[PDB]
Amino acid sequence: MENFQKVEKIGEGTYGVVYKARNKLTGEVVALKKIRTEGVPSTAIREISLLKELNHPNIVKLLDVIHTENKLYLVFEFLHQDLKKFMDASALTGIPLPLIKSYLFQLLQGLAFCHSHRVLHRDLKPQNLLINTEGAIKLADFGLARAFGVPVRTYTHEVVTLWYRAPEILLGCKYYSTAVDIWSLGCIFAEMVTRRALFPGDSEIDQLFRIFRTLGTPDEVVWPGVTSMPDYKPSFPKWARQDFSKVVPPLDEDGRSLLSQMLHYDPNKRISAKAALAHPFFQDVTKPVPHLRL
Ligand SMILES: Nc1nc(N)nc(-c2ccccc2O)n1
DSSP states (O other): OOOOOOOOOEEEETEEEEEEETTTTTOOEEEEEEEEEEEEEEEHHHHHHHGGGOTTTTTHHHEEEEEEEEEEEEEEEOSSEEEHHHHHHTTTOOOOOOHHHHHHHHHHHHHHHHHTTOOOSSSSOOGGEETTTTTEEEOOOOTHHHOOOOOOOTTTTOOOTTTTOOOHHHHHHHHTHHHHHHHHHHHHHHHHHSSSOOOSSSSSSHHHHHHHHHOOOOOOOTTTTGGTTTTTTTTTTTOOOOHHHHTTTTTTTTHHHHHHHHOOSSSSTTTTTHHHHHHHHGTTTOOOOOOOOO
């Protein structure tokens, strides 16, 4: 659009490509997400438009929902770096625990906020978590899955990230809950700590089995109703559960306890964002300044 002097493409998401752009007139720098065709659901436009009203320090502000020329663009406030890039940049030394704690605490505040407003993310991953020089971290692209639905393949063909998908989704549950976001965040927490993805599945079944090999194959005792899930198969191998001390070393017991509650199989037992904020792990939380190289 001629309203911008486009700076560059900065990444690609499940629901569309993201660009950095500068308003030729206002000079404002923003993130522009181009949503990908038939007739563009009218239901979704109003739903996504309602997200412009969300205001929280830990949620990337949705400035505008542009529906012109029969195209859909989301205009977001711009942050300079995503968590995936920061984790890669911090891979040699690791992100200091106080910063990991600060980021997790903030992310839980953002999730607690969205969930209380009946907004789910459903596709949380390091790539859509953004950070700034002031130590803040924010979640972007909330409520897109509920509004549009869910693709399967990108026009550019990009290996969809299954690494952060909750088990109930992988087992074919049709009715997601806020618990799926807690699961994704738990996976991200683990990754910040170990500097390695927790469950790096290559396929949907490999993703599920990686979860099973670590947390044990779920059964009716730990997850009532699991054997009746749409894609559950009695033929699934039965793996014994591992110890978290082996999963996220050298995280302390407060952190392991919190992570274990975020990774409960049963969405109904999985800790809520609000309850997580009260966990002892956050007793000494602070807000450190990250070492950001832009
Ligand atoms: N890959 C990526 N990189 C930066 N620096 N920002 C974003 C971004 C994505 C959505 C909303 C706001 C944003 O800054 N996305």
